Design an enzyme around this catalytic site. Structure first.
Site, PDB file in Angstrom:
ATOM      1  CG  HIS A   1     -54.150 -42.789  16.971  1.00  0.00           C
ATOM      2  ND1 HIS A   1     -54.254 -44.118  17.332  1.00  0.00           N
ATOM      3  CD2 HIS A   1     -53.648 -42.144  18.051  1.00  0.00           C
ATOM      4  CE1 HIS A   1     -53.840 -44.265  18.580  1.00  0.00           C
ATOM      5  NE2 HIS A   1     -53.477 -43.082  19.038  1.00  0.00           N
TER       6      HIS A   1
ATOM      7  CG  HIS B   1     -54.278 -39.439  22.383  1.00  0.00           C
ATOM      8  ND1 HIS B   1     -54.801 -40.348  23.278  1.00  0.00           N
ATOM      9  CD2 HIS B   1     -53.666 -40.166  21.418  1.00  0.00           C
ATOM     10  CE1 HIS B   1     -54.509 -41.571  22.878  1.00  0.00           C
ATOM     11  NE2 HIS B   1     -53.829 -41.488  21.748  1.00  0.00           N
TER      12      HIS B   1
ATOM     13  CD  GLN C   1     -52.928 -43.725  28.455  1.00  0.00           C
ATOM     14  OE1 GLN C   1     -52.696 -42.733  27.756  1.00  0.00           O
ATOM     15  NE2 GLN C   1     -52.415 -44.932  28.187  1.00  0.00           N
TER      16      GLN C   1
ATOM     17  CG  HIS D   1     -53.929 -46.876  22.219  1.00  0.00           C
ATOM     18  ND1 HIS D   1     -55.165 -46.345  21.909  1.00  0.00           N
ATOM     19  CD2 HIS D   1     -53.061 -45.831  22.229  1.00  0.00           C
ATOM     20  CE1 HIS D   1     -55.048 -45.039  21.729  1.00  0.00           C
ATOM     21  NE2 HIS D   1     -53.784 -44.700  21.928  1.00  0.00           N
TER      22      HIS D   1
ATOM     23  CD  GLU E   1     -47.858 -46.420  21.774  1.00  0.00           C
ATOM     24  OE1 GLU E   1     -47.218 -45.384  21.462  1.00  0.00           O
ATOM     25  OE2 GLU E   1     -48.926 -46.400  22.421  1.00  0.00           O
TER      26      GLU E   1
ATOM     27  CG  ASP F   1     -50.002 -41.063  19.060  1.00  0.00           C
ATOM     28  OD1 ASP F   1     -49.068 -41.872  19.287  1.00  0.00           O
ATOM     29  OD2 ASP F   1     -50.963 -40.898  19.839  1.00  0.00           O
TER      30      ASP F   1
HETATM   31 FE   LIG Z   1     -52.701 -42.732  20.807  1.00  0.00          FE
END
Ligand SMILES: [Fe+3]
Ligand SMILES: [Fe+3]
Lengths: 423, 423
Positions: B58, B60, B153, B211, B214, B310
């Protein structure tokens, strides 16, 4: 044989009463102004309490007498209990189920219980226990009116062919449709499962009894759907929410809002004090919650609530003698229903309120009803509860079907003295 | 060139091992009874640990290397991070994305990472970063197998043309379908978004990585829908729930119920310790919750869980060198996986478990697999973790693709002494 019950006390009534019997029914109930003499064909209640029979509104006769088989639970949780049961379920035989069900049923007859609702796990393509229980129902019918609740223990939507098996159970004759929405994989399956349960109950004209929110999760609110669907269908009397232990953990504001619906809906509630005190609060450290549903509040609001034993020597509860006064004793303590009147009125939780839950049509000491009644060697509900008295006589269709000669205790002081623990 | 890796330790195995290589694959693995001599075409592991490559399940790569651009986050929250990212997203160019992705990828190659799953924000009609990342995927392929996860997102249902853009991303070649149900406007959009995500994954035969929850909200339970849909479609192996930080805040009873579904479903979990410890607990005062998902419990239950970095020098996390042993170190501490065996077995969380999460088909030190392996200058996982060792060699297709000559530390006492921090 029996023509009269004499010298009877009745809950909420002053004095002594004579109950006349004819053709297996109660023909008349007459006040007495003093003690009546015994005679042949009179059963002397001896100024003990006469009540309609005890009721077991929630038991699992397919799991009874299996504690520790093949393994113990252990963590003492609902969830491990289901796992242990699943292991035992794979080992069921027809005769195994009948023998264990009958063992507990005999304890129940001995304990003045003449009405029993048993859940039977129908998350089982073979329906082994259900087929056995349908035979047991016919066999025990002279002594106990047994309702069979088809219980989709592993979920309706969350188990292969769960809905089909539930319906098959009804087609085979189960009296009550069950559900377990908090055990479904998702909240949405939980809600959907209730729609399906209500649809089946309406299709087959059966009662409903949901294992409802048996979890210490303040977000488990399936009870509102059970009540709303009942209200919508106008079928409150026919519907029961068992457990509702999550309700112990709700905030007060939601509970207040909910209670309006609970009373409007007219649905029944079963609390299972011996099992709930054991299985609930297992995820707390300290302090640890009690985890029984809001019994005291229900009673205060006129919402029908009653007590079941739930499991007797099974995968969730290793103890029990199927004794309703013992169930009641635990519930009064854990629910803090400890005022004199609350304790005295406690019998309602294991008699009349449970009869309502079972939708019984012929129950209570009233002219025209079947002569089904029990005699407790106690002055009132408080005394019966305090001394945990046995059932002196159980009468069904005007015939004695059980009796207990009470224990006799002597202390040897300067002289021998009989001890009876009254008060 | 390379024909053998010699003098290798292997996790969970006693002694030393020789790994024979042929045609870019592992041909055989043979135990040694002592130390083998070096020779040409042998890579000497020098009694260090040999493992399959580290995995980054994971990250980005579209946000990497942008910390503080154009503005900082600041409150150190998920929500402000998304706002700061949105500002940076409006400024993206093709070359900008490729250069920053490549900068972090080189750190990853240096750190023995040969498998990376990057999320790429597809809440962007221009799909600028996605188009860049698809080129990067081809460019880095000799060194890293890069999976691209299309990440909506700003929501699927809560962003204009969100579902269309997500599908466009799959049509352009994204390997994994993403979702963000806790960021959707409503719980109902959250659940619906998951149905749509699963439908796309089945339509295109792609993996899923959500996701998921979170947020420090005990009512954020999208994970149950992710697991239930996976179970229904029989596709557990292909499905991942990233973050699940809300799970840190669930009551124990719901968590227990949920865990049965989590294990039955077979879905994967990613925890992101460096980022979670930073972004979670930001709405508490004191005491302040840790906010990592239930890693220890997952491991105890045999639920596949693993660790990601992450964000590396991005809008949510200003630090990092893309170092998996560092991620692991943080997770072991915050999760209290601090028993000797728990620490030693910690490598699984950044190797095998992460390979499972990526659904990898050719991973592990086994005959017939590609000769993809790394060598740590450490005796076992505990030692590697404690000393935060570099990757001495990274081998891919039987060729060395990275090496680190370790630091050399001397103290000048009465005589000079080399310090290696063993133990
Ligand atoms: Fe993430
Ligand atoms: Fe039950």
């Amino acid at each position: 044989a029996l023509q009269t019950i004499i010298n009877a006390r009745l809950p909420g009534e002053e004095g002594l009463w004579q109950i006349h019997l004819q053709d297996g029914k109660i023909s008349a109930i007459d006040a007495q102004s003093g003690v009546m003499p015994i005679t042949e064909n009179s059963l002397d209640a001896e100024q003990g309490l006469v009540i309609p029979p005890f009721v077991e509104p929630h038991i699992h006769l397919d799991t009874t007498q299996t504690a520790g088989q093949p393994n113990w639970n252990q963590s003492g949780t609902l969830f491990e209990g289901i796992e242990r049961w699943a292991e035992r379920k794979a080992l069921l035989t027809h005769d195994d189920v009948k023998q264990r069900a009958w063992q507990t049923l005999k304890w129940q007859i001995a304990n003045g219980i003449q009405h029993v609702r048993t859940h039977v796990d129908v998350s089982d393509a073979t329906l082994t226990a259900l087929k056995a229980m349908l035979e047991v129902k016919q066999e025990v019918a002279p002594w106990i009116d047994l309702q069979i609740a088809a219980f989709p223990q592993e979920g309706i939507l969350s188990y292969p062919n769960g809905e089909a098996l539930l319906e098959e159970a009804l087609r085979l004759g189960a009296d009550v449709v069950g559900a377990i929405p908090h055990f479904e994989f998702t909240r949405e399956y939980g809600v959907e499962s209730l729609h399906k349960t209500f649809a089946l109950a309406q299709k087959y004209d059966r009662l409903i009894d949901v294992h409802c929110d048996e979890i210490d999760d303040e977000q488990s609110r399936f009870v509102e759907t059970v009540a709303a669907l009942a209200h919508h269908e106008g079928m409150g009397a026919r519907v029961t929410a068992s457990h509702t232990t999550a309700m112990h953990s709700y905030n007060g504001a939601y509970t207040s809002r909910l209670f309006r619906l609970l009373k409007m809906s007219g649905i029944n509630f079963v609390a299972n004090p011996l099992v709930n005190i054991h299985l609930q609060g297992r995820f707390d450290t300290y302090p640890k919650r009690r985890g029984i549903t809001r019994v005291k509040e229900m009673l205060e609001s006129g919402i029908n609530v009653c007590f079941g034993h739930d499991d007797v020597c099974g995968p969730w509860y290793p103890l029990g003698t199927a004794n309703m006064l013992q169930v009641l004793h635990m519930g009064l303590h854990v629910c803090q229903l400890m005022g004199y009147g609350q304790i005295n009125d406690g019998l309602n939780l294991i008699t009349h309120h449970s009869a309502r839950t079972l939708n019984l049509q012929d129950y209570g000491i009233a002219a025209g009803n079947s002569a089904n009644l029990i005699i407790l060697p106690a002055e009132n509900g408080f005394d019966a509860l305090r001394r945990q008295v046995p059932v002196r006589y159980s009468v069904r269709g005007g015939k004695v079907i059980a009796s207990t000669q009470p224990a006799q205790t002597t202390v040897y002081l300067e002289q021998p003295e009989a001890i009876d623990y009254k008060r």
